[PDB]
Chain A
Amino acid sequence: KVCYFTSNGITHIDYKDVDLLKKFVSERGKILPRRVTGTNAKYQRKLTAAIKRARQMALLPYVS
């Protein structure tokens, strides 16, 4: 149960990197909770924003 971002040393999540973000959403495309993905709280927020800015820009779906 390790954080992706702490692990790989990633300090900035980018809403344009869709193929990363897709690791953290469900197949429906709901965001996955932090207790499932191992993510740090710190990153979960960042991640949460990114995905939201993605979704606005139709890079991810709101609902698959």
Chain B
Amino acid sequence: MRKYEVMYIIRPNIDEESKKAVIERFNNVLTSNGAEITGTKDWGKRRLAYEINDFRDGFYQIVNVQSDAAAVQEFDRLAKISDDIIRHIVVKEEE
């Protein structure tokens, strides 16, 4: 497997109780589909340099992983449908 760098903005209109639930959900998604989480920074609420879905700020999470496609693609799948995650990107790292 190969090292990816998930990043995603949670919507700014949630408590720290509901935030952690999102974080736990999507870390659990990755590790449920054969991933491992190697790092997990939290940038905390920055200003968005434009307006995504009528929010001017949001909560950056940055998940490093190692996984196969399936894990990352499943994340990708679920990170669309979800209304908590407003934008994201998977990225392949310095391999």
Contact = CB atoms under 8 A, between A and B. Distances in A.
Contacts of B94: 12
Number of contact residues on B: which range applies?
Answer: 10 to 19
Interface in B41-64: 46, 48-50, 52, 62
Interface in A44-64: 53, 55-62
Interface in B1-24: 7, 9
B49 A59 contact: yes
Interface of B: 7, 9, 46, 48-50, 52, 62, 87, 89, 91, 94
25 contacts: A12-B94, A15-B91, A16-B7, A16-B62, A53-B89, A53-B91, A55-B49, A56-B87, A56-B89, A57-B7, A57-B9, A57-B87, A57-B89, A58-B9, A58-B48, A58-B49, A58-B50, A58-B52, A58-B87, A59-B46, A59-B49, A60-B49, A61-B49, A61-B50, A62-B50
